[PDB]
Amino acid sequence: PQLEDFPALIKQASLDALFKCGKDAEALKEVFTNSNNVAGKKAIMEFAGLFRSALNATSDSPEAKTLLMKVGAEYTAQIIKDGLKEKSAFGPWLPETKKAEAKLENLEKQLLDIIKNNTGGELSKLSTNLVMQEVMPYIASCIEHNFGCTLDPLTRSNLTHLVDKAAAKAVEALDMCHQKHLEMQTLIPLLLRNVFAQIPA
């Protein structure tokens, strides 16, 4: 019998692992269990599974493991600060169709390819095109599905700055890690989700 055949069990194991990378696991388990925000809990469950995969992929790489524990610490911190109430920073950036799920997967693929083949100023140029041309439209689509309201230029402008700045830090962190094999492949989806969670709710 393997765990992977038992989704509820591997979900449990994943949450435990994630919350272990925060400052107080018990407090995290309390906030998660007491929350009634279904989308938010599902975003955290998804990140937790990805975090489990990254743990397994980074076990022989000290620096990648350090970065992993750094993102886990950030994401869990953001969970505690948020509180997972009715209105939450967790949940809104989840793909609501199979098409949107595919867009997210593809941009994660392209970002891996770019990091693998570039560094420095050229990585910065190419990752910036991905943020603007792939990440921002994904985010805009999530908002526009809410009330069928198209995004105003000011929201787009301010969201762009926030996401670009946060995505650039992640890319620079991956680049340094790289200079030091599924480490980056598993780190990318965590770092991107940690970016989305910074959009205020």
From Swiss-Prot:
Q: What name has this protein been given in UniProt?
A: Cell invasion protein SipA
Record carries keyword Transferase = no
Subunit text: Interacts with human PERP.
Q: Which GO terms describe its molecular function?
A: actin binding
Q: Where does this chain mainly localize? A: secreted
The residues of the intact protein that this chain contains are 49 to 263 of 685
- Can you supply one Gene Ontology CC term for this chain's record? extracellular space
Q: Does the keyword Coiled coil apply?
A: no
Functionally, this protein is described as follows:
Actin-binding protein that interferes with host cell actin cytoskeleton. It stimulates actin polymerization and counteracts F-actin destabilizing proteins. Potentiates SipC activity; both are required for an efficient bacterial internalization. In vitro, forms a complex with host cell protein T-plastin increasing actin bundling. It inhibits ADF/cofilin-directed depolymerization both by preventing binding of ADF and cofilin and by displacing them from F-actin. Also protects F-actin from gelsolin-directed severing and reanneals gelsolin-severed F-actin fragments.
So what family is this one in?
Answer: Belongs to the SipA/IpaA family.
Keywords from UniProt, A to Z, are:
Actin-binding, Secreted, Virulence
> Which GO BP terms, alphabetically?
positive regulation of neutrophil chemotaxis
Q: Where in the cell is it found?
A: Secreted
